[PDB]
Amino acid sequence: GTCALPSTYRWSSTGVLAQPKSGWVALKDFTTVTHNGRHLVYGSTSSGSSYGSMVFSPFTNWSDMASAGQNAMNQAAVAPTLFYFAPKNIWVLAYQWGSWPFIYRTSSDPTDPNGWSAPQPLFTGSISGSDTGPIDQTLIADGQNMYLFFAGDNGKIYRASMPIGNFPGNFGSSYTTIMSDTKANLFEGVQVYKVQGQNQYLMIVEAMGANGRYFRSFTASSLSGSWTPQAASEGNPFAGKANSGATWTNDISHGDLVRDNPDQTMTVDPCNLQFLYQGKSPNAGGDYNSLPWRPGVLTLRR
Ligand code: EMC
Ligand code: EMC
Ligand SMILES: [Ca+2]
């Protein structure tokens, strides 16, 4: 009863799923798990002038995201990663921009935007040839090791690791440069997942295409292994204008595959693949930080 990842992806898409509440011009950079039978979604916010973060009130159906309460975090967790860390029975929210390059907080109740612990260092390193520094972290563990993957708006993807018994904790300053390409080809928004029922991991990376933002996919048999391009061009992307089925956006940008199991393995079911992404009206212009990003969901057509 197991499925494999397709070689060519075809999606159908929702329309815009929610509008930002008063004071925000964008909802961005989503991370999502199922918690108590409901969708739990964190994201970045932008007022145009500054970035923050928020969590939606839990909702059962994506069609009800539009009415879900939008709960601001009193301390910004930009480009967040949410998961349940089973070995310690604790939830983890990792993010960027704060006292360290990457940061995390912990909680026993991930629905509360302000129930998170004092911030702790996740990563303290620096990268060369990057205007942004380390950005868009994700975290993923197998049975043995916890991995940190991140980008740099510079064509590189980076990786750090620790024995899983040492997490939650600080990866420190060290990293491995695992991928190197043009800036456009490996830009940001890196995510990594375990493919359920297969000895395979899936990496997606946001790229800058001629037509807009899209995702390129890569596979590996191990988290410390080499990554093989899968659906890795604008014409044959993991998800993009070419195959999204979205009518409201030419961009498929920073989000998260829908994770039914909320745990640190980041496991996805290839039989039921869905992608919570950010998109925007093709007519929207102005400064990047003011762009009206919105949530959408892609569902894989099999
Ligand atoms: C409330 C965690 Hg099964
Ligand atoms: C739209 C079913 Hg989570
Ligand atoms: Ca992310």
Query: What secondary structure does DSSP assign to 96-109, as a single string?
Result: ESSSSSEEEEEES-
Strands 213-220 and 78-85: unpaired
Strands 267-268 and 188-195: parallel
* 108 vs 142: CA distance, rounded Å: 22
Burial class (CB in 10 A: 0-12, 13-18, 19+), 13: buried
- Asked if residue 7 has its Cβ within 6 Å of ligand 2, the reply is no
The type of residue at 9 is Y
As given in the structure block, the two tokens for residue 132 are: 């942004």
Short-list 254, 137, 148, 261, CA closest to 194? 261
* 206 vs 276: CA distance, rounded Å: 14
As given in the structure block, the two tokens for residue 52 are: 């923050």
Cα→Cα distances 82→33, 68, 125, 174, 283, Å: 7, 19, 21, 23, 32
Question: Locate tokens 């949530």: which residue?
Answer: 295
Q: Contact at 8 Å (CB) between 180 and 228?
A: no
Provide Rg for the chain, Cα atoms. 17
Burial class (CB in 10 A: 0-12, 13-18, 19+), 78: buried
Residue nearest to atom 1 of ligand 2 (CA): 61
The structure was resolved experimentally with X-ray
CA 64 to chain centre: 21
Phi and psi angles of residue 286, each rounded to the nearest 5 degrees, phi first: 100, -165
Task: Please give the number of the atom of ligand 2 that sits closest to the Cα of 62.
Answer: 1
Distance from residue 145's CA to the centre of ligand 3 (Å): 20
* 29 vs 214: CA distance, rounded Å: 14
Q: Contact at 8 Å (CB) between 68 and 84?
A: no
Short-list 194, 184, 133, 195, CA closest to 158? 133
Topology adopted by domain 1-302: Tachylectin-2; Chain A (2.115.10)
Beta bridge partners of 41: 32
- Asked if residue 39 has its Cβ within 6 Å of ligand 2, the reply is yes
Question: Locate tokens 């493919």: which residue?
Answer: 195
* 93 vs 256: CA distance, rounded Å: 14
- Return left, alpha or beta for 49; rule: phi > 0 is left, psi -120 to 50 is alpha, else beta: alpha
Beta bridge partners of 298: 13, 275
* 49 vs 202: CA distance, rounded Å: 35
Q: Resolution of this entry in Å? A: 1.9
